[PDB]
Amino acid sequence: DQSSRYVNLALKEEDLIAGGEHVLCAYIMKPKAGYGYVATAAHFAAESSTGTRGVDALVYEVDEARELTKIAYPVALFDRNITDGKAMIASFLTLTMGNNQGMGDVEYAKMHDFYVPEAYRALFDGPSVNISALWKVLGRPEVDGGLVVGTIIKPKLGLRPKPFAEACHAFWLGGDFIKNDEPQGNQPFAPLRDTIALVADAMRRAQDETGEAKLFSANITADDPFEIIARGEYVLETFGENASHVALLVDGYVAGAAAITTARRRFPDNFLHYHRAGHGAVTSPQSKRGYTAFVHCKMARLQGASGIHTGTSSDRAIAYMLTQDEAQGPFYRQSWGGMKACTPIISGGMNALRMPGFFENLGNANVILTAGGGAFGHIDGPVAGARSLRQAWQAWRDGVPVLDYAREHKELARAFESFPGDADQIYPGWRKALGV
Amino acid sequence: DQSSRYVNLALKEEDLIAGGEHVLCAYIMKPKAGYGYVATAAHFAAESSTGTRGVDALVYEVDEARELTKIAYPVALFDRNITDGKAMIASFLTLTMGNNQGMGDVEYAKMHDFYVPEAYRALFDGPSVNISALWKVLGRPEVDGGLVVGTIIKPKLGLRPKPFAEACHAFWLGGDFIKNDEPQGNQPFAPLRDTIALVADAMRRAQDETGEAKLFSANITADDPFEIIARGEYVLETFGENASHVALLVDGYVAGAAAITTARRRFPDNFLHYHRAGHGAVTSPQSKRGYTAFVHCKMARLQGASGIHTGDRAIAYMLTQDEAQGPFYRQSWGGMKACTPIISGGMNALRMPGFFENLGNANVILTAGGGAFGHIDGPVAGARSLRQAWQAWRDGVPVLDYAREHKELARAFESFPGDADQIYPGWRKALGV
């Protein structure tokens, strides 16, 4: 209702930016069969702002062909806490992704990128701690501390307390970090209270036997915030001297933003592990509505997640936007004005042999790896498998040729052979160089 | 995964229900090119469980032509609170709907219905209060109290505190209930503390002038539960003697399950208005992923929403009856309180009766736009005509008969002639003008 009121196509995006009084959002939107693009874009602006410039959201650019709509949102539109003045993602979502996901003259609309000015950005919580908290526990440097080797305990559900704690103890003989699988909590056959006490003990045992610090990411997701807090408090107290070796895992997608903020504000000294479960329905690229993975992860940083699962366009782009002070998104360049980084958590698996190639492309190895147990395949076993990943990181870090590092490191050496086919392709003459 | 382990097509749904130890879910699932249907469903149950009532989720019925997969989840799989032993929707979502959806051999999966046995249903919060709390305030019978007439203040945002409170006052001369628009909260040009104080006073005035009780639904949505609580406490406090007349609006979609549970458990005596802003991203019927609006609303009753925007008579029945039929499962609610449907749109006085006739009752909250705003005499007249059309239907009096004695209603025909033409042919001569 105001394809003149809600549309100002002569505005310079640079102007908007420089101004610092508007949140900008870029969408991939298509108007229903028949309706005008600009009119519909007008309709989406109005509908996402004022019912019926200044407090009005404006369409500043459109690309009919590209199904591209960019809208400026005055920062005065966003809600903030009566308690402390701070911003809230709930509001950001309502305004730029709310009832506008339900219109009638619009076929689909998906947010691809957003820009938040200094004034607004500064009102967000941001990460309290990141991987540097973990580096510290590991006895690593707080700047470029490198790779954290982890896993997920499997089966997903089924293990009793003792069996679960023994599987933890066993991976900790080779690796650094273990996280509960999504669903693990207080099932009647594996009570959280019992399980956690046993996991804490398994942590002590692997620490004494290994001479190395170990880490656990404990699922505290619940519907009730007070339930989240009681889980967190039970976990930290139980872990005792090992309380700083504990990360708090919250599935922020299924429990939502309030679950995330509960852990963030109540346990700001522990890494807040933001797990993404079933955010598939929206972020998935076959989906034309909602927002992208990029957008999701960028939001996570402002929310205060310490790390978030990001996966093995470009995730590299996600990684940069999450960790750098100045990053380029698909549409907007963003400054973070000193907000702490949010650590990428990568999953899947690459043997020790491919690992190096990943770090090269990324440019750092400052990530948490939560690898399928397959990436831990090795003729000598999974302890050796996890060790080889660490050895591959160490070679890469030191700038030492891998073939040479292997000669003095059994598990990396032995790994070459575990995947002789991979070596061939990658390092021809390894055998030569090894004896084998 | 294991096509022989997680598959038990000899299991009878009837036995499953009677046993009372399995959550059942029905999905519209398509496997990617080249994978066998049973195989894929088996992998889907596996990745959703341990990746009968062992601990493994079992596929008990398949229909590849209809893309139908039904899985039985032992109740032992579901997380429950260490604090009080109650169930959590967060666990229901993760298990039957989390990860398990960004798969490989599976192209799309949408949950269409679920069955909760008694033992598990009993561990959910459920609604604390529903429309019967509003009826009590309005001086209506607590059983079939009928229609609650409201609106949304517009514009969506922009109005200063005083202007906002007066717009409220104005509508309250004709209608019963007003809700904040989803995004209205503590914007710098209309601070929540100032706005709410003015609205509470507009409520006192409207009430003194009309001799009728008025209701307000205030947005308490936030990321921080402690901010949610603070908003709620400030609102109840400020409404003073009118605290019972406030509904707490929470967008459980943008803020999630924990925002809803915060309000449910901290203010169990006030109507929890569950706004779905944004759900349309998943539940819409273009998305072949997530779950339907039916499922969304069904969960909302278990979580404890007092009312939910429903925008069918099937969702309406599932939300309000003690026993309802869903697309695949018949559910008993065991005395768990009804969750009231909140209807919106352009329902004018003329369409009201047909709608009541279909639904079979008028026990809803209508947040009316242009059913009210669209009346020739303005919104107050619009509001009154909606109330008149309900009274006529309630009483068993024909609306033309009623419209003859009630000017608002009569003037509603002139306001919506297409509707009149098409619903009450002969209306013109009848109202004679």
Are B388 and B352 in contact by the 8 Å Cβ rule? The answer is no
DSSP state of A363: S
Separation of alpha carbons A221 and A193, rounded Å: 15
DSSP for residue A72 = E
Comparing CA positions, the residue from A116, A128, A98, A109 lying closest to residue A31 is: A109
A254 touches chain B (CB under 8 A): yes
The CA distance from B326 to B318, in Å, is 7
Q: For residues A299 and A256, what is the distance between their CA atoms, to the nearest angstrom? A: 12
Q: How far apart are CA B337 and CA B272, in angstroms?
A: 13
Q: Is B158 in Cβ contact with A187 (below 8 Å)? A: no
Q: Do B82 and A234 touch (CB under 8 A)?
A: yes
Closest CA to A245 of A170, A150, A133, A165: A133
Nearest to A261 among B56, B100, B223 (CB): B223
Contacts of B417 (CB under 8 A, 6+ apart): none
**Of A156, A189, A256, Cβ closest to residue B255:** A256
For residue B225, say if its preceding peptide bond is cis, omega within 30 degrees of 0.
Answer: no
Q: Do B289 and A303 touch (CB under 8 A)?
A: no
Helix (H, G, I), strand (E, B) or coil at A221: coil
Alpha carbon of A30 to those of A7, A25, A59, A107, A287: distances in Å? 17, 16, 14, 6, 13
Task: Outline which parts of chain B fall under CATH 3.30.70.150.
Answer: 4-124
Q: Is A125 exposed, middle or buried (0-12, 13-18, 19+ CB in 10 A)?
A: buried
Distance CA A226, CA B129 (A): 22
For A241-294, the DSSP string reads: GGGGGEEEEEETTTS-HHHHHHHHHH-TTS-EEEE-TTTHHHHSTT--SEE-HH
Residues 6+ apart with CB under 8 A from B432: none
Residues 6+ apart with CB under 8 A from B344: B152, B309, B311, B366, B367, B368, B369
Residues forming a β-bridge with B290: B110
* Contact (CB, 8 A) for A250 and A232: no
- In one letter, which amino acid is B365? I
Q: CB distance from A104 to chain B under 8 Å?
A: no
Expressed in percent and rounded to 5, the helix, strand and coil fractions of chain A are 40, 20, 40
- Centre a 10 Å sphere on the Cβ of residue A389 and count the other Cβ atoms it contains: 27
Longest pairwise C-alpha distance within chain A: 79
Could you identify the residue written with the tokens 């469903």? B41
Residues in B closer than 8 angstroms to A101, CB to CB, are: 278-281, 284
Task: Return the bridge partners of A22, or none.
Answer: A74
Catalytic residue among B32, B154, B162, B288: B154
Angle between helix axes A257-266 and A89-97 (nearest 10 degrees) is: 160
Sorted by sequence, the CB contacts under 8 Å of residue A370 that are 6+ apart come out as: A150, A151, A152, A177, A179, A309, A345, A346, A347
CB pair distance less than 8 Å for A83 and B193: no
Quote the CA–CA distance of B5 and B176 in Å, as a whole number.
57
* CA dist., res. A138 & res. A154, Å (int): 24
Which of A52, A94, A108 is nearest residue B154 as measured by Cβ atoms? Answer: A52
Residue A287 CA to residue B327 CA, distance in Å, equals 25
CA dist list (Å): A53 to A188, A195, B196, B406: 57, 57, 26, 44
The CA R_g of chain A, rounded to the nearest whole Å, is 24
Q: What token pair was written down for A226?
A: 């007070």
For helices B257-266 and A257-266, give the axis angle rounded to 10 degrees: 70
CB contact under 8 A, B90 and A228: no
Q: Cβ A255–B260 below 8 Å, yes or no?
A: no
Contact A271, A306 (CB under 8 A): yes
Query: What is the end-to-end Cα distance of chain A in Å, rounded?
Result: 76
- CA angle in degrees (0–180, nearest 5) for A70-A258-B122: 125
DSSP structural state of residue B7? B
Question: Rounded to whole angstroms, how far apart are CA atoms A372 and A153?
Answer: 9
Instruction: Report the residue numbers after which chain B has a gap, meaning the C atom sits over 2.5 angstroms from the next written residue's N, or none.
Output: 51, 311
Q: Residue A14: which residues within 8 A CB-CB, separation 6 or more?
A: none
- Number of A/B CB contacts below 8 angstroms equals 273
Beta pairing, strands A290-291 & A106-115: parallel
Residue ranges, comma separated, of all CATH 3.20.20.110 domains in chain A are 125-418
Q: Which residue has the tokens 């104080």?
A: B197
CATH topology for the A125-418 domain: TIM Barrel (3.20.20)
Distances in whole angstroms, Cα of residue B119 to Cα of each of A58, A365, B4, B232, B260: 52, 49, 29, 32, 23
Angle made by CA atoms B149, B151, B152, in degrees to the nearest 5: 160
Is A97:A21 a contact under the CB 8 Å cutoff?
A: no
Q: Looking at chain B, which residues constitute the CATH 3.20.20.110 domain(s)?
A: 125-415
User: In Å, what is the CA distance from B103 to each residue of A190, A388, B28, B86?
Assistant: 27, 29, 15, 30
- Please give the C-alpha separations between residue B11 and each of B116, B120, B295, B300, in angstroms, as whole numbers: 17, 20, 24, 30
B181 close contact with A: CB closer than 8 A: yes
Q: From CA A133, how far away is CA A245, in angstroms rounded?
A: 9
Name which of A337, A273, A277 is nearest A305 in CA terms: A273
Q: Is B259 within 8 Å of A260 when comparing Cβ atoms? A: no
Residue B105: both structure tokens together: 């051999």
Pairing of the two strands B68-74 and B148-152: unpaired
The Cα–Cα gap between A262 and B318 comes to 32
A78 contacts on B by Cβ (under 8 Å): 187
Kindly list the distances between the CA atom of residue A253 and the CA atoms of A222, A258, B77, B223, B249, in Å, as whole numbers in the listed order.
12, 10, 20, 13, 21
Q: Note the residue count of chain B.
A: 433
Phi, psi of B224 (to 5 degrees): -85, 120
Q: Do A179 and A247 contact (CB within 8 A), yes or no?
A: yes
User: For residues B372 and B175, is the Cβ–Cβ distance under 8 A?
Assistant: yes
Three-state DSSP at A395 gives helix
Using only the alpha carbons of chain B, give its radius of gyration.
24
* Locus of tokens 């209807």: B343
Q: Which of A196, A177, A148, A29 has its CA nearest to residue A97?
A: A29
Give yes or no for a contact between B181 and B156, defined as CB atoms under 8 angstroms apart: yes
Residues 6+ apart with CB under 8 A from A314: none
Just list the catalytic residues of A: 154, 275
Among B22, B275, B279, B298, the one annotated catalytic:
B275
Compute the nearest-CA separation of A338 from chain B (Å): 22
Q: Is B357 exposed, middle or buried (0-12, 13-18, 19+ CB in 10 A)?
A: exposed
Q: At what angle do helices A225-239 and B257-266 cross, to 10 degrees?
A: 100
A182 close contact with B: CB closer than 8 A: yes
The H-or-E segment that residue A179 falls in is: strand A177-179
Selected from 3.30.70.1150, 3.30.230.10, 3.20.20.110, 3.30.70.1290, the CATH number assigned to the domain covering B125-415 reads 3.20.20.110
**Facing A287 at nearest CB: one of B76, B77, B289:** B289
**B270 close contact with A: CB closer than 8 A:** no
- Look up residue B310 and give its two tokens: 């429903």
Alpha carbon separation from A293 to A9, A310, A315 (Å, rounded): 28, 8, 9
CA distance B176 to chain A (A): 21
CB–CB contact A222 B93 (8 Å): no
Both tokens of B222, joined, read: 């936030």
CA separation, residue B340 to residues A76, A327, B131, B220 (Å): 34, 47, 6, 19
Residue A102 identity: G
Short-list A215, A271, A231, CA closest to A248? A271
Q: At B131, give phi and psi (nearest 5°).
A: -50, -25
Label residue B252 exposed, middle or buried (CB < 10 Å: 0-12, 13-18, 19+).
buried
Place of tokens 């959703």: B48
How far out from the chain centre does Cα B243 lie?
22
Sign, CA torsion B125/B181/B366/B143: positive
DSSP letters of B279-344?
GGGTSSTT--SEE-HHHHHHHHHHHT-SEEE---HHHHHHHH-SEEE-SS-EEE-TTPPP-EEEEE
Round to the nearest angstrom and report the end-to-end CA distance of chain B: 73
Interface subset of B 273-302, CB within 8 angstroms of A: 277-282, 284, 286-287, 289-290
Q: Rounded to an integer, what distance in angstroms lies between the CA atom of residue A142 and that of residue A35?
A: 55
B259 touches chain A (CB under 8 A): yes
Quick one: tokens of B229?
């609580």
B/e letters for B35-56, b = 16+ CB within 10 Å, e = fewer, are bebbebbbbbbbbbbbbebebb
Q: What angle do CA A421, A427, A432 make, to 5 degrees?
A: 90
Q: Which of B28, B22, B105 is nearest to B295 (CA)?
A: B28
CB contact under 8 Å between A281 and B88, yes or no, is no
Beta-carbon separation of B101 and A50 below 8 A:
no
Distance CA A237, CA A192 (A): 13
Nearest to B245 by CA among B209, B212, B285: B212
B89: closest CA of chain A, how far (Å)? 7
User: C-alpha distances in angstroms, A267 versus A136, A220, A249?
Assistant: 18, 12, 11
CATH code given to domain B4-124: 3.30.70.150
Chain A positions touching B281 (Cβ under 8 A) are 97, 101, 281-282, 289-290
- Given a contact cutoff of 8 angstroms between Cβ atoms, the answer to whether A151 and A371 are in contact is yes
Question: Amino acid letter at A187?
Answer: Q
* Partners of residue A58 on adjacent β-strands: A72
The H or E element containing residue A425 is helix A420-426
Contact assignment for B281 to A290 by CB distance below 8 Å: yes
At residue A327's C-alpha, the angle toward residues A321 and A328, to 5°, is 100
Cα–Cα distances in angstroms (integers) from residue B229 to residues A229, A258, B79, B83, B418, in the given order: 16, 12, 25, 20, 47
Helix A315-323 and helix A293-303, axial crossing angle in degrees, nearest 10: 20
Question: At a CB cut-off of 8 Å and minimum separation 6, what does B212 contact?
Answer: B138, B176
CB < 8 Å from A in window 35-74 of B: 47, 49-51, 55-56
Between chains, do B76 and A290 touch, taking CB under 8 Å as contact? no
Helix (H, G, I), strand (E, B) or coil at A1: coil
Token pair belonging to A9: 């196509």
CA distance B270 to A403: 69
Which candidate from B77, B80, B186 shows the least CB-CB separation from A157? B77
Is the bond preceding A74 in cis, omega lying within 30 degrees of 0?
A: no
| Residue carrying the six token digits 């130890």 | B21
Known binding-site residue numbers of A: 99, 156, 179, 181-182, 276, 309, 347
DSSP state of B406: -
Nearest C-alpha in B relative to A225 = B258
Nearest 10 degrees: Cα torsion A396, A397, A399, A402: -30
Does B309 contact chain A (CB < 8 Å)? no
Q: Rounded to an integer, what distance in angstroms lies between the CA atom of residue B216 and that of residue B153?
A: 11
Q: How far is CA B267 from CA B127, B228, B297, B304, B374, in A?
A: 12, 11, 21, 11, 36
Q: For residue A393, what are the contacts with CB-CB under 8 A and spacing of at least 6?
A: A146, A147, A149, A355, A359, A365
Residue with tokens 């998943």: B282
DSSP per position, A185-205 = S-BTTB-HHHHHHHHHHHHHH
Provide the token pair at A130.
């990141």
Q: Which residues of A touch B83 (CB under 8 A)?
A: 224, 226-227, 230
Contact B77 A223 (CB under 8 A): no
Decide if A226 touches B, using CB distance below 8 A: yes
Chain A contact present for B317, CB below 8 A: no
Contacts of A157 in chain B (CB under 8 A): 49-51, 55, 77
The residues near B69 (Cβ < 8 Å, ≥ 6 apart) are B26, B27, B29, B41, B44, B59, B61, B62, B109
B126: alpha, beta or left, given left = phi > 0 and alpha = psi -120 to 50? Answer: left
Note whether A95 and A78 are within 8 A (CB).
yes
Q: Which helix (H) or strand (E) covers residue B216, if one does?
A: strand B215-219
Helix, strand, coil % (nearest 5) of chain B? 40, 20, 40
Q: Which of A436, A432, A380, A433 is nearest to A411 (CA)?
A: A380
Nearest 5 degrees, angle CA A196-CA A200-CA A202?
110
3-class SS string, A288-342:
CCEECHHHHHHHHHHHCCCEEECCCCCHHHHHHHHHCCEEECCCCEEECCCCCCC
The length of chain A, given as a count of residues: 436
Is B275 annotated in the active site? yes
Contact B252, A257 (CB under 8 A): no
Q: How far is residue A233 CA from its own chain's centroid?
A: 24
